[PDB]
Structure formats: C-alpha cells, structure tokens
Design an enzyme around this catalytic site. Structure first.
Site, PDB file in Angstrom:
ATOM      1  N   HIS B  41       0.813  -1.173   0.042  1.00 39.23           N
ATOM      2  CA  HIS B  41       0.117   0.068  -0.035  1.00 39.23           C
ATOM      3  C   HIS B  41       0.692   1.297  -0.179  1.00 39.23           C
ATOM      4  CE1 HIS B  41       0.232   1.335   4.168  1.00 39.23           C
ATOM      5  NE2 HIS B  41      -0.133   0.136   4.697  1.00 39.23           N
ATOM      6  N   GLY B 143       2.109   6.139  10.102  1.00 39.17           N
ATOM      7  CA  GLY B 143       3.259   6.071   9.651  1.00 39.17           C
ATOM      8  C   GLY B 143       4.319   4.627  10.424  1.00 39.17           C
ATOM      9  N   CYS B 145       3.086   1.589   9.598  1.00 38.04           N
ATOM     10  CA  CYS B 145       3.067   0.533   8.871  1.00 38.04           C
ATOM     11  C   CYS B 145       4.454   0.162   8.428  1.00 38.04           C
ATOM     12  CB  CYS B 145       2.380   0.744   7.473  1.00 38.04           C
ATOM     13  SG  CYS B 145       0.645   1.660   7.625  1.00 38.04           S
TER      14      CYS B 145
HETATM   15  C1  LIG Z   1       1.240   3.330   7.224  1.00 35.95           C
HETATM   16  C2  LIG Z   1      -0.249   4.058   6.856  1.00 35.95           C
HETATM   17  C3  LIG Z   1      -1.111   4.279   7.801  1.00 35.95           C
HETATM   18  O1  LIG Z   1      -0.470   4.982   8.708  1.00 35.95           O
HETATM   19  N1  LIG Z   1      -2.407   3.780   8.016  1.00 35.95           N
HETATM   20  C4  LIG Z   1      -2.857   3.232   6.763  1.00 35.95           C
HETATM   21  C5  LIG Z   1      -2.891   2.046   6.469  1.00 35.95           C
HETATM   22  C6  LIG Z   1      -3.365   1.305   5.463  1.00 35.95           C
HETATM   23  C7  LIG Z   1      -4.176   2.101   4.441  1.00 35.95           C
HETATM   24  C8  LIG Z   1      -4.770   1.668   3.086  1.00 35.95           C
HETATM   25  C9  LIG Z   1      -4.517   0.138   2.745  1.00 35.95           C
HETATM   26  C10 LIG Z   1      -4.427   2.323   1.758  1.00 35.95           C
HETATM   27  C11 LIG Z   1      -6.182   1.729   3.264  1.00 35.95           C
HETATM   28  C12 LIG Z   1      -4.258   3.534   4.772  1.00 35.95           C
HETATM   29  C13 LIG Z   1      -3.590   4.018   5.966  1.00 35.95           C
HETATM   30  C14 LIG Z   1      -3.317   3.797   9.114  1.00 35.95           C
HETATM   31  C15 LIG Z   1      -4.520   3.084   9.027  1.00 35.95           C
HETATM   32  O2  LIG Z   1      -4.604   2.000   9.118  1.00 35.95           O
HETATM   33  N2  LIG Z   1      -5.729   4.192   8.752  1.00 35.95           N
HETATM   34  C16 LIG Z   1      -6.900   3.652   8.727  1.00 35.95           C
HETATM   35  C17 LIG Z   1      -7.288   2.923   7.135  1.00 35.95           C
HETATM   36  C18 LIG Z   1      -8.095   1.618   7.195  1.00 35.95           C
HETATM   37  C19 LIG Z   1      -7.553   0.605   6.775  1.00 35.95           C
HETATM   38  C20 LIG Z   1      -8.348  -0.739   6.806  1.00 35.95           C
HETATM   39  C21 LIG Z   1      -9.713  -0.444   6.927  1.00 35.95           C
HETATM   40  C22 LIG Z   1     -10.339   0.616   7.119  1.00 35.95           C
HETATM   41  F1  LIG Z   1     -11.490   0.738   7.490  1.00 35.95           F
HETATM   42  C23 LIG Z   1      -9.354   1.921   7.379  1.00 35.95           C
HETATM   43  C24 LIG Z   1      -2.537   3.630  10.506  1.00 35.95           C
HETATM   44  C25 LIG Z   1      -2.892   4.229  11.843  1.00 35.95           C
HETATM   45  C26 LIG Z   1      -2.486   3.697  12.985  1.00 35.95           C
HETATM   46  C27 LIG Z   1      -1.666   2.671  13.172  1.00 35.95           C
HETATM   47  N3  LIG Z   1      -1.394   1.968  11.996  1.00 35.95           N
HETATM   48  C28 LIG Z   1      -1.940   2.388  10.683  1.00 35.95           C
END
Ligand SMILES: *CCC(=O)N(c1ccc(C(C)(C)C)cc1)[C@@H](C(=O)NCCc1cccc(F)c1)c1cccnc1
Ligand SMILES: [Cl-]
Lengths: 301, 301
Positions: B41, B143, B145
């Site tokens: 991602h 951040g 991930c």
């Molecule tokens: C490393 C990015 C991040 O901080 N995220 C994040 C992970 C994954 C995504 C996608 C795969 C693009 C959707 C986006 C952002 C944070 C995160 O998980 N935010 C919520 C997004 C989400 C994922 C899955 C299902 C859903 F309904 C929403 C994040 C924040 C805190 C800790 N780890 C990651």
C-alpha cells in the site's frame, strides 16, 4: 491507537552485555569503552556473602581471576577497582559497540527498560518503574545479576540501574551505575525486606490521560477538587502525595484532552472510593502506575 | 521471581529497519540481505484507497520511484516485485547487519515482539499476541506501517508479522512476511471489521501455571472437569475452545507443578464464576491471555 507497556529498543545496550566469571560465580557485566561494570558481589563465595569485607576480598584477587567473555571472545582484564557496590574491570579492548551514554540516578516513579541477561546474553526486554519503596517489580532468575536498566534520549543511553538481588517478596533491588543502591539495601546475605509500597499518583493520572486520548471516558465527571483535598484522599489509599510539580508536569496532557489536572483528580478520587464497577481502562481492572507523563506523551506521539 | 510481559531484545531487528518513500507516502521497510520488504500500500494513491489495483499501480513505477533510506544512506533500488500484499524492493547493497532469520506464519494465540518504527527509526518494543480474530492489540500511530513482529530462538529471528493497518475498533491488521494477511482483511479502505474476539484459553491456563510456579495457589480448588464440560462453560465466557492439543502442550507445566491440566481447567471455571474477590494473580485483576505455554516455560524458573 493502542497502549502498551513499551520498552526502549535494546540494541544499543545488547552490544554492551558481557559475561563476568569470578571463581564459581557467573553474572553479567556492562562493557562501556575499556571498562566492564558488574555487581561487586561477584567476588563473594558462599561463606563471604554473610559478612563480606569487599575491600579485603578484592585485594586477594588478581586481574586474571576475572574471566570476561564478550560473545565468544575472552576480554583481558588489566585492572580492577571498586566504586561503592559496583566493580569496574579495566579491559585491554575498548567496546567498538559503545553507544553514546550517561550514568544517571533516577527517582522513584520514573520508569526504565530492563534488558534481562544470563551469561552475558540478552534474554528479554521489559519496562518497569522504580517503586516509591525503591524496589523494582522485575522478572529475574538466578544469573540475572548485572542486567541493566536504561532510558534512551536522542541516541544517548542513560544507564540508571544494575540488578544486584531479589528480596523475599519476589521484588528486586539494585544500584545506579556508580554503585549506589536504590533503597535501604545492602549487598549482603542478611535479613532485608521491601518497605510498604505506595501507588505513583502522577503516573496513574498520566495513564488516565492516555485512556482519554485512546477513547476511554466513562470515569470522567463534572467535578473538581483542591490539591489538598485530593492528597487527604490519596494518603488514605496508599497513594503518593501529588505535588504542584506533578500538576505542572501533567499540563501538556491536560491541555490536549481539555481535562484540568484537578478535574482528573476528582475522577481518580471517585475511582478510589467506588472502584471501576465492572468496567476497565486501557484493558486493565487496576489503576496502572508504571507509565510516566513523559511515557504517555512519547507513546501517544 | 516475578512475571512480566517480556519482549525479545530488539537489536537484531533494529539493524534491519529502513524508511521506504514512494511519492508522498513514507513507511517502514525490513532490509534483509539485498531485499527490502514493505506493505504494497506504499504505492497506493490518496485519491483511490478504496479499490486500488496494485498490479496496475506497480507497472507504472520504476526502481528510482522508490526511495529507500537506511540511517542517513540512500539505498539504490535495482528491482521490484509484489508477493501477495508485500512489495519486495531489490537493493544494490546487502544489509551487513542481516541476522540469521526465517519467515514464519503464526497461528492465533501465538505471541511475538513488535518493534514499532516511524520513518525507519525504532521507537519502542512491546509484546503482542495474534488474537483468535486474527487482529493484534498493538500500539501504532500513523507511519507505523511496515513495523514487524518477531520471535528470537538461538540468535535466529523468526519474522512473523508486518503491520499494514488499523481497523475501525483501534486494533491492527497485517500480514506474514510472504504478504498473506492474517484474517479476512484486505489492504483497501473498505468496510472491514474485526470479528468478535475471544480469550485464548490455553494461554490463560499457562499463565495460571506461571502463578503456581511463582508461589500463588489461592485460585486452585478440589475439583476436576472433563474437557467437554470445561468447553461448555468456557464458551459461555467467550473463551476459545480448549483442544486435546492444548492439553498435550500444557503437559510440561502440569508435570512441573503437579497440577493436572483438567484440574487447572476446574480452577479457571471457578475463577470465571467468582472473579478474583479483590485478589490479583501475578499483579493482575484480569485473567491474562497473552502468554503462551512456551513463554511461561521460557520466563519462569
Ligand atoms: C502506514 C499508513 C497508515 O498509517 N495507515 C494506513 C494503512 C493502510 C491504508 C490503506 C491500505 C491505503 C487503506 C491507509 C492508511 C493507518 C490506518 O490503517 N488507517 C486506517 C485506514 C483503514 C484501513 C483498513 C480498513 C479501514 F476501514 C481503514 C494507521 C494508523 C495507525 C496505525 N497503523 C496504521
Ligand atoms: Cl504458531
């Protein structure tokens, strides 16, 4: 999101752990530059521990009596001296993995990471706090002596604890890296006990702020209290007094959540007088006191 | 004596953490030999997080679009491939700090250490368990991930988890190091929710054995139970079924303490019924399920 008891990354400290053997005793040493630091009780036999004269036991030793092992390499001891309850073994090789470091003495309530070691080999890392009674609720077995406690700040390791012994209640006693014990303890085989412990109030309040930041608000109330009324309540529940310094230290967390420190104190007062009533806070049924205000800010940022 | 939630020393993993930047996104990578592993991602655009076509996004990238930073050194990307939900960036330099390692896929109930990182820089280490619903109750901010979960066995690092996302309930989802997610989760911003979580029964029993080893027996009773009667009661408290494999796995702890597994099961049934009555077990007012039988044997005497 999430809140865990988190230790500092231990790598900078793992590269300093060595095994120290003197006679039949094996424990851990901390190799910084050309000096290996370890508990002075490594020179004690079964007979000695009862009434040891460490200066008399040390004068009978030569450099080659101390076997220091760094991984699979024998370090050559070229000097030895005692500083309080810590033995300093001068070695012929400076540790190439010596990080930037300081020796700091911590206060009760402060937390630190412990790298538990056996035979100079790191086994695990955990977070713990210096209790108000100067003991630590650590996790140590035979051979863990010489394991160290530390904090990390901008690549600088602040060594604050060296493990020396276990008290009859299962709690642990040790020194700072200058060999000064935390608490009224001695490195002798004699009747010693941890004093009655108290709860670190500023730390419980910090943890209540961490719960608010993470979405746990059921304990909040409309009420406030004076610092003196709160301390009259706190003393009744074996809680450490809350000072104006603690209130000032909690300022950033109070401003972030919108909950004044004395307002969070009225919540803590109600939790102390009523209990949690089947509810939990950050997955705990007890009021957690081993996270400082700085630990909460660090993990939530 | 003592019992703590103990993580593995993180040094071997700290030396593998790098920063991966793709466009405006920065996250962590795991640099082993000449390959950097990270969540795919990282190539995902902000305008289409709902239905990304990773194969279509990846074919538009060249090696020089991925900026990899190991400390203050830029690593040169010379190849890229996708394996399930992980991106594997071939770099021109092999990591000199690459430890002896394996990629292992773990089962629910298993524990591991997480080295939380931001911008390729290790922030903290904590102990986690893979929940029965395949999520982990971690502590991760934006951040984080690409941060990894691991266990260490005789200098060999077993990488078992890579952090990908936070689900709406504050829990975390990720993959093994081959890019296969744990659970029914997808790296899309779609309506996903963690299934109902349950307590890891074998782990609570292991932790009750740890309490007996450390001197606590208050919770034991004169009763025993059949495995089936235990499971009928366990399901009523949202506990995972206890299988014959779990009973076999608890054999060593049963032999050490002299308490048969089904006798300990009768104690757990009673604790579920009565609670703790103001008491604690290993400093906890809740029944702890994030210590495996293996973790108890490793840490306890
Ligand atoms: C490393 C990015 C991040 O901080 N995220 C994040 C992970 C994954 C995504 C996608 C795969 C693009 C959707 C986006 C952002 C944070 C995160 O998980 N935010 C919520 C997004 C989400 C994922 C899955 C299902 C859903 F309904 C929403 C994040 C924040 C805190 C800790 N780890 C990651
Ligand atoms: Cl497993």
């Amino acid at each position: 999101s999430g809140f865990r008891k988190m230790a500092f990354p231990s790598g900078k400290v793992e590269g300093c752990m060595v095994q120290v053997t003197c006679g039949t005793t094996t424990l851990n040493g901390l190799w910084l530059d050309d000096v290996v630091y370890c508990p002075r009780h490594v020179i004690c036999t079964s007979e000695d521990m009862l009434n040891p004269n460490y200066e008399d036991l040390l004068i009978r030793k030569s450099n080659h009596n101390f076997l220091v092992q760094a991984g699979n390499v024998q370090l050559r001891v070229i000097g030895h001296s005692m500083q309080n309850c810590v033995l300093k073994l001068k070695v012929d090789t400076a540790n190439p993995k010596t990080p930037k470091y300081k020796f700091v003495r911590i206060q009760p309530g402060q937390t630190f990471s412990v790298l538990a070691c056996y035979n100079g080999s790191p086994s695990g890392v955990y977070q713990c706090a210096m209790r108000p009674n100067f003991t630590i609720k650590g996790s140590f077995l035979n051979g863990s002596c010489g394991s160290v406690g530390f904090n990390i700040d901008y690549d600088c390791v602040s060594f604050c604890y060296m493990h020396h012994m276990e008290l009859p209640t299962g709690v642990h006693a040790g020194t700072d890296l200058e060999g000064n014990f935390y608490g009224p303890f001695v490195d002798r085989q004699t009747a010693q006990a941890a004093g009655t412990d108290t709860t670190i109030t500023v730390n419980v309040l910090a943890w209540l702020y961490a719960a608010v930041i993470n979405g746990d608000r059921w304990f909040l109330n409309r009420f406030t209290t004076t610092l003196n009324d709160f301390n009259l309540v706190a003393m009744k529940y074996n809680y450490e007094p809350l000072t104006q310094d603690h209130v000032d230290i909690l300022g950033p967390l109070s401003a972030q959540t919108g909950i004044a420190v004395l307002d969070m104190c009225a919540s803590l007062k109600e939790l102390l007088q009523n209990g949690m009533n089947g509810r939990t806070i950050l997955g705990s049924a007890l009021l957690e006191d081993e996270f400082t205000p700085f630990d909460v800010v660090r993990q939530c940022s």
